[PDB]
Amino acid sequence: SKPLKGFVICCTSIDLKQRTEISTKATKLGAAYRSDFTKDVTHLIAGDFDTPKYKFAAKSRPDIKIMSSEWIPVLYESWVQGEDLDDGLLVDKHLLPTLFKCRVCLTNIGQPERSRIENYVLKHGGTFCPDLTRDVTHLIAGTSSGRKYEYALKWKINVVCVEWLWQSIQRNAVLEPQYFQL
């Protein structure tokens, strides 16, 4: 019984102790573990979207599933506890949210588009930020002007158009900001 036979797993921005735990448990579960992001990788466990590995998956690997750090610890525990494991192997439950760790602020966008954007941000696992603070990862700007725009630039926050959001949602992964500049 190798529940994860055929699974090839790679990790990105994972704590050393947790990554060692994941490599061990995934191997015991029957998966192939990869240190480097090799061609045969089927699943990428990610702790952040700001890594060459995550950026490669988002840009060039739409066949791979981007997973939460909890997937392997949770599935392994369930397995060794004698709990029942379905055909799913808790993949759907532990899929990393599309906008994982995104803190999205808006400027110069009117209503009802502002409400629409907020709802899609929350739906796809992001944090909606009415106020611009230095912890905002993305500022969706309607025009390249105003106080939010000026401070986001000073605070080195990504200033993107709304297509960053819509293309990230369609890809089901965080995409890079350089293609969505105003």
């Binding site: 110069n108 106020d131 611009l132």
Partner: peptide, 14 residues
């Protein structure tokens, strides 16, 4: 606010 640019009031939205 300090390190903060508050949300634009609805009446001032384009």
């Amino acid at each position: 606010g300090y390190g903060r640019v508050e949300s634009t009031p609805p009446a001032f939205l384009p």
